[PDB]
RNA sequence: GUAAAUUUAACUGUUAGUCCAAAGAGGAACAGCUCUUUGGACACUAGGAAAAAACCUUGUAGAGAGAGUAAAAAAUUUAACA
RNA sequence: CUGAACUCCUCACACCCAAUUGGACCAAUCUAUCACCCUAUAGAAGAACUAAUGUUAGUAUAAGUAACAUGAAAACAUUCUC
RNA sequence: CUCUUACUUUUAACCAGUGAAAUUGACCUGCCCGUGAAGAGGCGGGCAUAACACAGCAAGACGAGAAGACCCUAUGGAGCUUU
RNA sequence: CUCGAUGUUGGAUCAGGACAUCCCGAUGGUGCAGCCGCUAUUAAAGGUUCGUUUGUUCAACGAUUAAAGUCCUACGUGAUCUGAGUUCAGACCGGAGUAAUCCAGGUCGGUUUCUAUCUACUUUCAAAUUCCUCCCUGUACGAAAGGACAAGAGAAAUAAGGCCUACUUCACAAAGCGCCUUCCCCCGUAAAUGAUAUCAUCUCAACUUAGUAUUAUACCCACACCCACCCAAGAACAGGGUUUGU
């Protein structure tokens, strides 16, 4: 039974899980886009979002600095978190990352995901786009919308 | 081996089938199988069960006649048994003698 | 329930066999033939 | 065994014997070696028996072919198209006579299991039995427990 | 031949519009049923001995303690009636059973996730689809017109009810957890045998009897708790406070019915029949109904004098 | 009219129908009387089932059997009936069903004493 | 516990060819509009994703040349500028990674 | 009434036995027990006694979509009294 | 009345017992002489395999089962975790 | 131990790659009572019964493994002791 | 029957069945006043304890209990466990033997394999038993001593099925040491009216009453949105939710 168990069991145990997730997060901060097994990316995504919130507290908050020191194994990335990544999201309250499934890995057919910090300088991912508003179905619904709005104003 | 021994069962099963079919036809006329077969013999009618079963299926009017004949001979038997010898032999009870 | 000890038709305790009406008639039928044989062997 | 082989119903070729009898054997092809020992009995059959057998059956064309062969054979063909090949290897003259006569008398139909030892196209003269054959009719054909004129 | 879902082909602009449109229709349909007695109700017969009325479908909110005036603590389970409406009536003749039945449904769900046959059924009824539908055996005098809303005040404090729900699903479980088998000793030599069934049958029969207790799927089946006392009714939020615990997890749907226990037979003489009509009610009920023995939150502290 | 079958002797009390659910303790034995009140067609159905040949055709034959406890027969079944079979047992008449002609025809066999309190 | 008898091919074919064992047909395969290669509805197109990765790898190699060592991450934002382009007003104060190729059409300048 | 028998010549295999009826012995007037005797059956066919080596019917060999038979089915129901 | 491989019926007949014993045929092979799309009369012999936990080789069953393996990201440079 | 519970790792199950072993007369391989070389999935009488996977279990297949090591037999061995 | 192997004591685990009933139910008799007993008929739904020594089955003893039942199931159950005992190879004591060795003796030590092919089975879904306290009552009974039954009220234990408010182990949850719910019968006899047999007679006489359940009711019940995501659902599959598909 695993009712309400929100964390996955990966690596060699609880400590190894954190270390595995930490290495993924460190890579993400440096490169701003990485690919890894889908389950591991999904697990790390929560930590990648919260790291930005700690970065927004500022480099003068000693608690934030300790959190960043632990989670970023390469110390040149700690200035980037506080001075590059966190200012970029100054006007957002969340949704700093986007996660998309990519084709299964060749060797072991593992389910794979790409994760990136929004607003990076890298070539954009081929994001899934919704159907145009000009399609047959969307035009029939636009007519229905127009009609309802006209009947309400009357 | 089964094919060899089955030749006995084939003959046995065929005769069982004829008796079942003759029994059915006899009951349609209110006669039990032993009454029909027994009394037909007493009329010197030597039709075997294979032919009797065929007649029941394909010659139903002849079979009713045979059933009627057996029924008549059966009633003649009763009349004779009830009598003390005063009565002459039944018309259908007379046996044709050969020499 | 209702087992016969050992084999059915041998030994101390056996399955009881009963004489049917037709078994009796069969025996009597052959007794009559032998009785007549006695007669024809008397002369 | 019966289950392991085909079967057929008793039949004839063109209702043979109904208006007239027609011999079904149509052709006989013998192959008798001049020198083979196995063909010794076949050579003696060709010297005294085949000619007298042809006189009796003028509707059968007999083809005697003398050629080198290790196994002499007779091939019988029938009007219905059946072809039968029977070996006469090392058979006596009397044995061959019996075989040849048997082929003359056969219809040519397959020598397989016959389901019934009889055949008829008119099994019934008085009407084939059906469930109403011996049932009495009822006034106005009323069914059991049926209210009339309600 | 490829599968589709409701917003697969919708554009960015149309997805919010469609959500708002269908949401408003659901709310309007629910509001249109709030006056059952003004919409040609069926005959409201008086209660008679031997009469069986409809029950409710409620969601299990959780558990809460309450104390009685004698000082005793009783835990209760809160059951909230969420969009409960009568759906179908089947006559005794057509039921195929000894009694007529009334179908009740609870809790609104999305129309985009239901089968077409179900959607057309709800279209004719004029209600949004319900998550769970349950069948209540009733007497002819207790029939209610399909579409009538049902409320928590259908039940009253002091009544006893039975609650049926699916138990918590524990998946595949061993005999120890599933059946309470003792298992085997921890030490003193045991070889790879601590939680195992042991012997499952005798040697003679050379088989395993049907019904033999073995490892397998545990829970996630319907169970019924009988004779639970209704301590309190919150009419504003439509919550029923029921004694003790009920089967299932919090936020599951439960079937609430009058208790069938011999001792509680023919206690509906004073209960709403065929149901509670708040619109018909002459005097609005207070926000909370309390059983006489319950300590109300604002009552003075207990003193034993 | 399978509800109105009649057993000879004391078969109502003595004849037992045995079944087993398959579970431990599942052996069940009920008298003919108990079964009849539980299922008014069971007795006739079981009697027929046991007489049919013990082969795979039996259950097909049972599909052609239509048992009804009373005198109500569905209209469809009633419409397809062809012939009614004679009842195998002649039902004996009760003393109240005899006509006065029949009663008068049977002689009085003995003369009771005039001074006897019958 | 050993097999008490050999399993027949008739039995084995029933087990092996049971519908549960068979491969299920996929109904979520669709054509990619950008490139025309097949893709799954919920998965990014492999062809398009590979193209993006190839350009990303080239840019990352250029970033490495500018960094010229480990632990040299910049403290400012970065902008990739292709041949024939100059920094905009919004690109001032950002490390400029120059690519010796024409800007890809799918890659939109911002 | 029947057709075998002895002798001469030349050999092999069998020499670890079961039940049934009958006369007995041992045992416990136990054993599907053990030991002799007389006979049968089995270790060969087929039918019957529910299934069935040993009980009953029956043997000599093939084909038949004829026929007459053999053995062959379990019966029973109860306590008033001067 | 049913009911056998008993008996009769049409036709045919060497054609239902272990060990053992007598007899009639015979596959293929080689040789002599024939034969010459595969045979004949004889003479010979490593002369016939549904069974030895047989020998060798092939391929199944168990079974696609038991079991086995590669720390992480990345520009493949490098760095990080242990 | 009363009396067990929770969590981690391994194993496990699913996907991908690779891929053994004992075992196997043939099997279209149910249950009850009875029978029988004396303890029946296969016989008699009943009952039950569309077809086919996956995961568990160990009551039966007198389950697999080893031509019983106990016991007896063989004019079969061997070691040791000895008037 | 089995020696080309049917694993051999007691225990653990799980129990299936018989009734010749240990306890609980219903009755007859009594040298049955009552309270306790004795004996017989009926009843197998439910129940039938924990410890010290001993490998023990038993037995003895301590403390309990409504009661600590008798048996069968390959002396049930080792492809589920255990190995103290018994029953190899080491050794000691007593005894036997010239010795090698031996003993229905005692004593210390001594390897318990198996990946499940087939059969069978894996939620017989839901009516429960019992003790005690109070009361009846110091009443019926009896010379006294002693001392009930039925009815009623409550409170518990066990069993079954659930649950997490608190407590506890714990901490998005799973658990017990915690909490909640739990509903019919059962036939042995005792009596009327009344014939054979004009009294009488409870009747394998016709019949009436105690005296019975068509076990009641409950639960379950609508189903080409379904690629994908989430889940109190879950090995896989399946199931619920997405009006929560940036
Ligand atoms: K015996
Ligand atoms: K017999
Ligand atoms: K715990
Ligand atoms: K097993
Ligand atoms: K042995
Ligand atoms: K099997
Ligand atoms: K009397
Ligand atoms: Mg892992
Ligand atoms: Mg015959
Ligand atoms: Mg026996
Ligand atoms: Mg669960
Ligand atoms: Mg334990
Ligand atoms: Mg071990
Ligand atoms: Mg262990
Ligand atoms: Mg001798
Ligand atoms: Mg003969
Ligand atoms: Mg002969
Ligand atoms: Mg030859
Ligand atoms: Mg040889
Ligand atoms: Mg060979
Ligand atoms: Mg071999
Ligand atoms: Mg396997
Ligand atoms: Mg594995
Ligand atoms: Mg490993
Ligand atoms: Mg496994
Ligand atoms: Mg695999
Ligand atoms: Mg073997
Ligand atoms: Mg048996
Ligand atoms: Mg077997
Ligand atoms: Mg074995
Ligand atoms: Mg041996
Ligand atoms: Mg020697
Ligand atoms: Mg063996
Ligand atoms: Mg038990
Ligand atoms: Mg008793
Ligand atoms: Mg044992
Ligand atoms: Mg073991
Ligand atoms: Mg075992
Ligand atoms: Mg030991
Ligand atoms: Mg010594
Ligand atoms: Mg010892
Ligand atoms: Mg030691
Ligand atoms: Mg196992
Ligand atoms: Mg009292
Ligand atoms: Mg009286
Ligand atoms: Mg009187
Ligand atoms: Zn593409």
Short mmCIF file of C-alpha atoms (C1' of nucleotides) in Angstrom, two decimals, chain E residues 4-7 26 60 63 73 75 98 110-117 122 130-131 133-134 137 164 167-169 171-172 177-178 181-184 188-191 193 196-197 199 201-204 208-212 214-215 217 219 221 223 225-226 243 245-246 248-251 255 257 260 262, chain K residues 11-17 73-74 76-77 79-83 113-115 119-127 160-166 173-175 179-184 216-228 232-246:
data_model
loop_
_atom_site.label_atom_id
_atom_site.label_comp_id
_atom_site.label_asym_id
_atom_site.label_seq_id
_atom_site.Cartn_x
_atom_site.Cartn_y
_atom_site.Cartn_z
CA UNK E 4 -10.43 12.19 -29.59
CA UNK E 5 -11.20 14.17 -26.44
CA UNK E 6 -13.36 17.23 -25.95
CA UNK E 7 -10.73 19.98 -26.26
CA UNK E 26 -24.89 22.98 -15.23
CA UNK E 60 -17.68 11.47 3.41
CA UNK E 63 -14.55 12.60 11.29
CA UNK E 73 -17.19 11.22 23.98
CA UNK E 75 -16.73 10.35 17.39
CA UNK E 98 -40.94 -7.61 -4.74
CA UNK E 110 -18.06 16.49 -16.14
CA UNK E 111 -20.19 15.73 -19.20
CA UNK E 112 -17.01 15.43 -21.28
CA UNK E 113 -16.11 12.14 -19.55
CA UNK E 114 -19.41 10.19 -19.72
CA UNK E 115 -20.75 7.76 -22.30
CA UNK E 116 -23.17 9.08 -24.90
CA UNK E 117 -26.01 6.86 -23.65
CA UNK E 122 -29.31 13.18 -18.37
CA UNK E 130 -23.86 12.28 -11.51
CA UNK E 131 -20.84 10.29 -10.38
CA UNK E 133 -26.27 6.16 -9.05
CA UNK E 134 -27.86 3.91 -6.42
CA UNK E 137 -36.25 -0.13 -2.67
CA UNK E 164 -22.84 1.45 2.38
CA UNK E 167 -13.89 -0.12 1.57
CA UNK E 168 -10.37 1.25 1.24
CA UNK E 169 -8.43 -0.72 -1.36
CA UNK E 171 -4.39 -4.36 -3.11
CA UNK E 172 -2.88 -7.83 -2.96
CA UNK E 177 -3.00 -8.77 7.02
CA UNK E 178 -5.91 -10.15 4.98
CA UNK E 181 -3.27 -15.46 10.48
CA UNK E 182 -0.62 -15.76 13.19
CA UNK E 183 2.28 -16.49 10.86
CA UNK E 184 5.37 -18.26 12.15
CA UNK E 188 14.35 -20.49 16.53
CA UNK E 189 15.30 -21.85 13.11
CA UNK E 190 12.49 -20.78 10.79
CA UNK E 191 13.64 -21.07 7.17
CA UNK E 193 8.73 -18.97 6.63
CA UNK E 196 3.12 -17.78 5.12
CA UNK E 197 -0.25 -19.55 5.29
CA UNK E 199 -0.92 -25.95 5.56
CA UNK E 201 -5.80 -28.52 3.55
CA UNK E 202 -5.57 -32.14 4.64
CA UNK E 203 -3.77 -34.86 2.71
CA UNK E 204 -6.75 -37.18 2.25
CA UNK E 208 -8.22 -27.29 -1.63
CA UNK E 209 -11.78 -26.55 -0.52
CA UNK E 210 -13.57 -23.66 -2.25
CA UNK E 211 -13.53 -20.61 -0.02
CA UNK E 212 -10.15 -21.43 1.53
CA UNK E 214 -5.55 -17.35 0.81
CA UNK E 215 -3.49 -14.33 -0.28
CA UNK E 217 -6.88 -8.63 -3.24
CA UNK E 219 -10.64 -4.30 0.36
CA UNK E 221 -15.48 -3.92 -1.95
CA UNK E 223 -19.56 -3.01 2.92
CA UNK E 225 -22.34 -0.37 8.58
CA UNK E 226 -25.70 -0.90 10.29
CA UNK E 243 -22.19 7.90 14.89
CA UNK E 245 -17.08 5.34 11.28
CA UNK E 246 -18.33 4.43 7.81
CA UNK E 248 -14.41 4.00 2.57
CA UNK E 249 -11.95 6.86 2.30
CA UNK E 250 -12.65 10.53 2.91
CA UNK E 251 -14.29 12.24 -0.10
CA UNK E 255 -25.25 5.32 0.27
CA UNK E 257 -30.54 4.59 4.08
CA UNK E 260 -33.36 -2.16 8.65
CA UNK E 262 -35.53 -5.18 13.83
"C1'" G K 11 5.64 -29.04 18.11
"C1'" A K 12 4.44 -24.49 14.89
"C1'" U K 13 0.85 -22.91 10.88
"C1'" C K 14 -3.88 -23.71 8.84
"C1'" A K 15 -7.42 -26.46 9.89
"C1'" G K 16 -11.75 -30.32 7.07
"C1'" G K 17 -15.04 -33.85 9.15
"C1'" U K 73 -8.35 -36.85 8.47
"C1'" A K 74 -1.08 -41.25 5.33
"C1'" G K 76 -4.32 -34.47 8.89
"C1'" U K 77 -0.48 -30.99 7.33
"C1'" A K 79 7.94 -29.41 -2.61
"C1'" U K 80 5.04 -24.35 4.45
"C1'" C K 81 8.55 -24.29 8.95
"C1'" U K 82 11.08 -26.60 13.13
"C1'" G K 83 15.08 -31.00 14.46
"C1'" U K 113 17.42 -29.61 -1.44
"C1'" C K 114 13.61 -28.23 -5.00
"C1'" U K 115 12.81 -21.66 -10.11
"C1'" U K 119 -5.39 -30.60 -10.81
"C1'" A K 120 -7.58 -27.69 -6.77
"C1'" C K 121 -7.94 -23.10 -4.49
"C1'" U K 122 -7.13 -17.49 -3.82
"C1'" U K 123 -13.76 -11.79 -0.68
"C1'" U K 124 -19.41 -19.38 0.98
"C1'" C K 125 -20.53 -9.85 0.04
"C1'" A K 126 -24.38 -8.93 4.97
"C1'" A K 127 -29.08 -12.46 10.81
"C1'" A K 160 -16.81 -11.04 12.27
"C1'" G K 161 -16.79 -6.47 9.39
"C1'" G K 162 -14.91 -1.55 9.15
"C1'" C K 163 -12.44 3.16 10.47
"C1'" C K 164 -8.30 7.34 11.96
"C1'" U K 165 -11.42 12.23 15.84
"C1'" A K 166 -8.23 11.69 19.73
"C1'" A K 173 -0.56 8.09 4.76
"C1'" A K 174 -0.20 3.00 6.81
"C1'" A K 175 -1.31 0.90 11.76
"C1'" C K 179 -12.45 3.70 18.05
"C1'" C K 180 -17.26 2.17 15.70
"C1'" U K 181 -21.26 -1.61 14.08
"C1'" U K 182 -23.19 -6.60 14.64
"C1'" C K 183 -30.33 -8.63 13.33
"C1'" C K 184 -34.21 -15.38 12.68
"C1'" A K 216 -36.26 -12.28 5.87
"C1'" U K 217 -34.36 -8.18 4.24
"C1'" A K 218 -29.78 -5.82 2.96
"C1'" C K 219 -25.60 -5.15 -0.77
"C1'" C K 220 -24.57 -5.14 -6.05
"C1'" C K 221 -27.38 -2.98 -10.94
"C1'" A K 222 -26.81 3.50 -16.30
"C1'" C K 223 -21.25 2.61 -19.72
"C1'" A K 224 -16.33 3.45 -27.56
"C1'" C K 225 -14.74 10.56 -23.66
"C1'" C K 226 -10.37 7.99 -22.77
"C1'" C K 227 -4.07 9.57 -26.73
"C1'" A K 228 -2.40 11.71 -22.26
"C1'" A K 232 -7.63 7.45 -1.37
"C1'" A K 233 -7.72 2.18 -7.69
"C1'" G K 234 -3.71 -0.99 -8.76
"C1'" A K 235 1.61 -6.59 -9.72
"C1'" A K 236 0.27 -6.23 -15.10
"C1'" C K 237 -4.54 -5.49 -16.95
"C1'" A K 238 -8.74 -3.24 -14.94
"C1'" G K 239 -11.22 0.80 -12.13
"C1'" G K 240 -12.37 6.33 -10.48
"C1'" G K 241 -11.35 11.68 -11.71
"C1'" U K 242 -9.83 15.49 -15.53
"C1'" U K 243 -15.85 21.48 -16.13
"C1'" U K 244 -7.78 20.32 -12.86
"C1'" G K 245 -5.02 18.89 -21.03
"C1'" U K 246 1.02 25.27 -19.21
#
